Structures are given as structure tokens and as C-alpha cells.
Design an enzyme around this catalytic site. Structure first.
Site, PDB file in Angstrom:
ATOM      1  N   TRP B 100       5.724  83.183 -19.430  1.00  0.00           N
ATOM      2  CA  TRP B 100       5.809  84.026 -20.285  1.00  0.00           C
ATOM      3  C   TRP B 100       4.504  84.871 -20.099  1.00  0.00           C
ATOM      4  CZ3 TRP B 100       9.387  85.915 -22.295  1.00  0.00           C
ATOM      5  CH2 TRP B 100      10.606  85.269 -22.900  1.00  0.00           C
ATOM      6  N   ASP B 171      -1.191  85.115 -26.448  1.00  0.00           N
ATOM      7  CA  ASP B 171       0.116  84.751 -26.885  1.00  0.00           C
ATOM      8  C   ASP B 171       0.635  83.384 -27.315  1.00  0.00           C
ATOM      9  OD1 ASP B 171       3.165  84.612 -27.091  1.00  0.00           O
ATOM     10  OD2 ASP B 171       3.552  85.294 -25.132  1.00  0.00           O
ATOM     11  N   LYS B 195       9.614  80.678 -33.692  1.00  0.00           N
ATOM     12  CA  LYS B 195       9.330  79.429 -33.228  1.00  0.00           C
ATOM     13  C   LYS B 195       8.557  78.530 -34.222  1.00  0.00           C
ATOM     14  CE  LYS B 195       8.837  80.824 -28.722  1.00  0.00           C
ATOM     15  NZ  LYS B 195      10.145  81.583 -28.029  1.00  0.00           N
TER      16      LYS B 195
END
Ligand SMILES: Cc1ncc(COP(=O)(O)O)c(C=O)c1O
Ligand SMILES: *Cc1c(COP(=O)(O)O)cnc(C)c1O
Lengths: 358, 359
Positions: B100, B171, B195
């Protein structure tokens, strides 16, 4: 009994909401919400394919158009349009016949020098729109951008475009799915989902495939038409609940007889309300008959000092979210697909007996 | 009972979903859904204000940070970060320890020439991460960007940053609100909601106020932090339902006892599951102890040809969405805030029964 005349986000078909309520916690027997599952599950995949198929059927989209589901509302598309489309060229034509068309121009100024074509007519106090045939277009425009239904003004442009091979872009946010349209006359059609569909946080884009491949490098990827098309609108995690719901709404649209039947229901509704406004001097709408929106119906009282009382008494009889825009004041009734004619009849009864009293 | 170990979109707290179900059609007595009303109503504006306020209290956001609710997911912030924050700088530091963080780099290539610092270690088959002390940062960089929890790899960086006047961007998509953090040490924190809040179609951005106003002209207004901030995230129509639900999540967090309680619960859940992996040779995890995510827990079997039977039998017992990534194969259990210890227990009990059978 409640009727919700909100302009956006807006009423959803009562049957769609009931079904969604029903399956909120246990969707398709999985013991989970539709909202808690991966967008790559078999199950969500099905929703994604069924809903694209259902939309192509309803609107009759040709095979050469991509159907994309996007983050960001229509205001994202005010940026995504020039970024995807400007290409080698330096401006595009922007038809300005009201607030939202104006809004798109103002964002366009980040990416180009938009040629602002003012299209508003003022004959007899009535406001209308120039016929397409006299719109002063460039030879050099990347595209032509217009808003066929101006949600605040209550002004629609009903005629189909028959321009050259000029690339036409249309913000159909507040009237998409209200009747049939000839998709082939258009380069891009876009619509934030939350008006005439209902659910907020999804935006629909329909794009002729030859226009892909020319996007500017600065365009964030989640707004790149090619990227979205290459990934079936799943370049990133999509607003899954919103997509499932819009899918329910396409199902409901098919149950109702499609957009041919929506056109009839919607004409019937608009004629009812406009009739109630026009019978009397007590209420006023000053849009030219030819350009009256079926979807968004603004109106004022002869005596504006009654606005608040009108709105409060309406709400007490269950008629909600009828407040107009600050500029005009008065009222706005948005009467989208989800709104049944009985909704509109309740409002016009109420309007009648409010005029009786006062 | 069904337990749903999906990585994203993910489980919502059961009580949040029972409340939303009960007011889906008649919210607040108005005879209508929260989905169906103006974002500019007093009722929705109350939602917006309360949610922002409950977030500030939960994380202890200081006064000089903006809390923004955005469209686009975290992949949109991969562009929104450089465009908002680069200024007249040519480059930014990108810390790379997995998927990511890698994806952020490729997007940033559109806007700058990023400085890619590879921070992964590898010792014994065990994957780990360099301590921040030894991260080779740059003086001319606009900021430093990293991912403290890599969802696919199961690799976390627990260490809070202590870099100087450098602007730190993080992030936090897969671990925001798992535990307290010192927000003051960051410039921008962001997180897709799907999430560890749970609801898809909303993204959180917390920005130190002084960083606003260097936005590039090419940035679409809906992604400009200053515009969002100036309009309280209602520059355009927000994802109303998503924002509301997140608000329910925030309230739920408060009733549970805040992020300090989440930390204990989340600790105890990881300990249980890593306990189940470690105590036997049948299951494996190749992440260094110090870097093991508490939220996403990939793991494999010694015999990878049991994977299908394992996933299939787990599902028959109510344990869903445990498939790993294909580079790794095996399994992945994401065990976000919403997931109770009982959920993780049913998974470890299942893991024990299965090893008993086929070990
Ligand atoms: C750590 C991390 N960052 C970014 C993303 C991507 O978010 P989205 O799919 O909303 O763009 C995910 C998923 C993730 O787990
Ligand atoms: C509401 C509206 C917009 C803006 O929609 P968002 O989804 O809030 O960006 C644009 N065009 C028209 C015609 C609208 O009615």
C-alpha cells in the site's frame, strides 16, 4: 403520511428502502450486510454486473459506451471532464443557463479558459433557453458542456443535441432516468446518484469509448475514465452500499415498465403541479413553458410574507423539504421518480386549501 | 453465529447495524431515512458536528487540526496528498515497506519524483521493518509518507514518529482507532473508512491547519483540504449515509470506553490468534514479532493443499472471508475493532480442531 420533496439527496422508492431494510443485516443468507463484504466477492460482483446490465437496458446504452460508477459527486466531474477531455486543445464550450452549468464553468477555469456561452432568454418576465440551433459554438472547442436540468432554477432543455461530431457533455444529475434519451447524441453523460436515482456517494458516467486515452497526467486515477473502464469501476474500493442500492433502483425501474412508463408518470405529475400553480395568481412560476423541469418545480407566493407559514403548515401535514433557494425564496418541490402522483396530489390539495384560508 | 474476517470492506459493530436497521426508514421520527435528506438539514448537520466532535475526543485531536470527511477512498488521497502538500518542492520522501505504501508511490509519480526509501528487513524468512531512527530521509522533501499498517502483508510499524520540522503523512486506513495515537506528531493522517470504521465510500483526513493553502491549481476542488475545511466537508454532497454510520461507530467506541479500551481488546485478540499460529508447526506467520499487525493476520499452512478444505470447513462453521493473498496463498484474518474476542476464539478453536484432524 409523509412526502419528502427534497432536491438531493432525495426520496428513494419506498419499495427499494423496504427491501434494503429487510436485508440490511442478512444479505442473500450470508449472515452479513451487503456493506460488510468485499467488492470482489462473487456476490458483489453479481450486483455490479446486474446493475450495469440493467442500466444499459433501461437507457438503451449502445455497446460503444462505457458505463462507470465513480466516487465524488458531480462536482468531481466538473474537474474530471476537462481533465479527461481537453486533449490537445485549450478550451471547450460551456452552455450557461443556470446555477449548475455556471458551477462547472467555475471549476473548468482551473484547467482551461472556458468559452462561456450564455443561453438564457427573458421574454415577458418568463425565463427560457435558446434553441440549440442558435447556440454560438466554436470550431475549436474540445467539447460542449451543458446541463439539461437545472435543479435550483427548474429549467430543463428537452431537445436532443444533433451537433456535428462535436463532443457533447451533459450533467444529467437531476433528471437522469426520468424518461428515455438518445444516448448516441452524447460524448459523456454524468449524474450524481442522489437525485433522481436517490443514494448519495456515487456518480454515474457514461462515456463513448473513442474518447478514452487522452486524459491529462495530473488527473488523479480514481477520476480517469480509461482507468475506471479498464478496471470495471473497481480501480479502488467502490461505495458498495450506494452501488447495491442504485442496483435495487434499476430493478424497481424495470418493475415499473421502464423509462417509457417513467416519462408518462412524470409528465402526469408535472402537469398536475404546474396546473395547480397556473390556475391561480396566488402562486407563481416564472419559467417558459417549453423549458419547465418536470423534476424540480420552484414557485413563489404572490404574498411572500406567507412563506414560513406555508412551509410550517405543509410540514405539519407531512409535506417536507419544500423550502426554495435563498435568491428566489418561496418554495421548491422536487418530484423525482420515487415520488408517486399521490405525493403531488397531497401537495396540490394542500396548496389549494392554503389559498382558501389565506 | 457468523464472523466475518474480511479485510475491507469489513465488519461493522453489530450494535451499530441493529440501530441503523431500526431507523433505516423512519429516522428521528421524521418518517424518512437519513439517506433521504439534505446534508444541509439541521438533523444531518447535527450528525456532522457530533461525529467530528466524537472523533476529536476519541483520538484527542488538538485544536489546530482540521477533521475532514472526503470522497474517493485512500487511493484518492494518494493524489490528494502530493497536490495539497508539495508546494514548490520537486520531491517527497516515500517510505516503502509493502503493497500500500508502494501504491502511493506510483500515484505520486504523476506529481513529483518521489524518493523511495526501502525500509523492509528480512531475517530468517521473517519480514520486518527498519526502526525510524535509521530511515534515510531527505532535506529537500515536501514531507515523509508511510503506511503504519500494511493490510496484505500483516506488517505494522508501532513506533510513533519523532522527526523534526518534517511533515509526516500517514496512511492509517487499516488501523485507525485500534489504539491511542499522538496526533500532534503528524502533518496529515488519512484513512479510508471501510476497515476500522467499517463503512465504504468515505475517507477520513486529519490535517494540521498550517499546511493548508499550498494546494496545486490542478487539484479538483473536492480533494482540496482548504476547500473542504472552509466548507466543513460539505463543498459538495457528502456520502451522507456513510458519514452517519461512522458517527454511529464513534458513539459505539465511546460506549465501549474509547481507544484505550480498544487497545486492550485488540491486544488480547492478536495475542490469542498469534498464540494459535505459534504453538504449532501446522500454521505459520513470517512477520517479525515486533512488526506483527494486530489488525490483519495472514498465515499459511505447512501443507498448502489443505487450504481449500480449511477455508471451506471454516465457512461451514460461520467463519467467512479468510482467504489469503495469492502471492502468499494460505489465509488472512482481519480482526478489526468490530470483531469481538469471541469471534477470534471461534477461529482459534476452529484452527485447533483442524490441526488435530489433519496434522
Ligand atoms: C493500508 C491501506 N491503504 C489504502 C487502501 C486503499 O483504499 P481505497 O480502496 O479506499 O482507495 C487500503 C484498502 C489499505 O488497506
Ligand atoms: C446537485 C447537483 C450537482 C452537484 O452534485 P454533487 O453530487 O453535490 O457534486 C451538479 N449538477 C446538478 C444538475 C445538480 O443538481
Amino acid at each position: 403520511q409523509v412526502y419528502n420533496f427534497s432536491a438531493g439527496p432525495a426520496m428513494l422508492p419506498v419499495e427499494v428502502l423496504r427491501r434494503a431494510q429487510q436485508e440490511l443485516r442478512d444479505w442473500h443468507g450470508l449472515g452479513t450486510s451487503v456493506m460488510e463484504v468485499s467488492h470482489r466477492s462473487k456476490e458483489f460482483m453479481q450486483v455490479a454486473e446486474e446493475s450495469e446490465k440493467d442500466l444499459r437496458d433501461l437507457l438503451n446504452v449502445p455497446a460503444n459506451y462505457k458505463v462507470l460508477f465513480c466516487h465524488g459527486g458531480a462536482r468531481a466531474q466538473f474537474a474530471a471532464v476537462p481533465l479527461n477531455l481537453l486533449g490537445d486543445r485549450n478550451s471547450a464550450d460551456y452552455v450557461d443557463g443556470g446555477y449548475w452549468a455556471h458551477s462547472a464553468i467555475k471549476e473548468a477555469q482551473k484547467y482551461c479558459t472556458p468559452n462561456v456561452i450564455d443561453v438564457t432568454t427573458h421574454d415577458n418576465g418568463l425565463t427560457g433557453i435558446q434553441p440549440m440551433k442558435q447556440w454560438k459554438l466554436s470550431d475549436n472547442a474540445a467539447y460542449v458542456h451543458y446541463c439539461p436540468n437545472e435543479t435550483i432554477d427548474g429549467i430543463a432543455i428537452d431537445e436532443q443535441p444533433d451537433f456535428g461530431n462535436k463532443v457533447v457533455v451533459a450533467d444529467f444529475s437531476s433528471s437522469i432516468l426520468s424518461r428515455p434519451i438518445d444516448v448516441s447524441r452524447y460524448g459523456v453523460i454524468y449524474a450524481g446518484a442522489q437525485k433522481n436515482i436517490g443514494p448519495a456517494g456515487l456518480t454515474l458516467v457514461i462515456v463513448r469509448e473513442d474518447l478514452l486515452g487522452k486524459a491529462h497526467t495530473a488527473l488523479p486515477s480514481i477520476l480517469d475514465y480509461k482507468i475506471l473502464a479498464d478496471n470495471d469501476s473497481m480501480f479502488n474500493t467502490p461505495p458498495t452500499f450506494a452501488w447495491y442500492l442504485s442496483g435495487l433502483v434499476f430493478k424497481w425501474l424495470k418493475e415499473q415498465g421502464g423509462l417509457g412508463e417513467m416519462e408518462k408518470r412524470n409528465q402526469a405529475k408535472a402537469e398536475l403541479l404546474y396546473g395547480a400553480i397556473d390556475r391561480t395568481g396566488f402562486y407563481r412560476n416564472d419559467v417558459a413553458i417549453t423549458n419547465r423541469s418536470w423534476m424540480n418545480v420552484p414557485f413563489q407566493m404572490a404574498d411572500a410574507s406567507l412563506d414560513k407559514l406555508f412551509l410550517s403548515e405543509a410540514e405539519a401535514q407531512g409535506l417536507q423539504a419544500l423550502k426554495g433557494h435563498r435568491v428566489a425564496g418561496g418554495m421548491r418541490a422536487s418530484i423525482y421518480n420515487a415520488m408517486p402522483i399521490e405525493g403531488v396530489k397531497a401537495l396540490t390539495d394542500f396548496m389549494a386549501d392554503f389559498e382558501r384560508r389565506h
